[PDB]
Write a protein that binds this ligand. Structure first.
Ligand SMILES: Nc1nc2c(ncn2[C@@H]2O[C@H](COP(=O)(O)OP(=O)(O)O)[C@@H](O)[C@H]2O)c(=O)[nH]1
Ligand SMILES: [Mg+2]
Length: 168
């Protein structure tokens, strides 16, 4: 069976953990310690293909984790998450993409730009802004809400589709 190794990155508070838990466990977590980094696995069917997802929910801590290092080394695609009501988190995206490029020594890493918390009306990062930054990176942009579970499977599945392209 096919496995896809995914890594979720972005500034604190954007909803990395909430997005991963909605994907895995199908509920919206009210709070999840911002410092906790763990990996999650699930068997899913994407486009009729039964597969295993293996996901790292990063937390940007300093202590050595071999696991973290192994996911950055062998991880096949990356979700780069900002929140649509947090301009600073959008300004921070580029730093994360650049880290990822350096780990892979490649400009061509499967990636999706995720604009989360789209349930919220106070949107300071507009669709066009995000769509334009993604077009500059040559990656997809997907709007999500871990709260309403809007776009959640689309974001992760899209990243799998980007991995399938790279593999060919
Ligand atoms: N309104 C709303 N709140 C969210 C959404 N995603 C996460 N949050 C909340 O924002 C806070 C930070 O989320 P978290 O997943 O801990 O972010 P992380 O630091 O990126 O892991 C939590 O209290 C979440 O419940 C969402 O899509 N909409
Ligand atoms: Mg978290």
């Amino acid at each position: 069976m096919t496995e896809y190794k995914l890594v979720v990155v972005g500034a604190v508070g954007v909803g990395k953990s909430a997005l991963t838990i909605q994907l895995i466990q199908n509920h919206f977590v009210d709070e999840y310690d911002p410092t906790i980094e763990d990996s999650y696995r699930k068997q899913v069917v994407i486009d009729g293909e039964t597969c295993l997802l293996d996901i790292l929910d990063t937390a940007g801590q300093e202590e050595y984790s071999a696991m973290r290092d192994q996911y950055m080394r062998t991880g096949e695609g990356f979700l780069c998450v900002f929140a649509i009501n947090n301009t600073k988190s959008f300004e921070d995206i580029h730093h994360y993409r650049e880290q990822i490029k350096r780990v892979k020594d490649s400009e061509d890493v499967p990636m999706v730009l995720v604009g989360n918390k789209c349930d919220l009306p106070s949107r300071t990062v507009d669709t066009k802004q995000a769509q334009d930054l993604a077009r500059s990176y040559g990656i997809p942009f997907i709007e999500t809400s871990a709260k309403t579970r809007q776009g959640v499977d689309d974001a992760f599945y899209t990243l799998v589709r980007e991995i399938r392209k790279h593999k060919e």
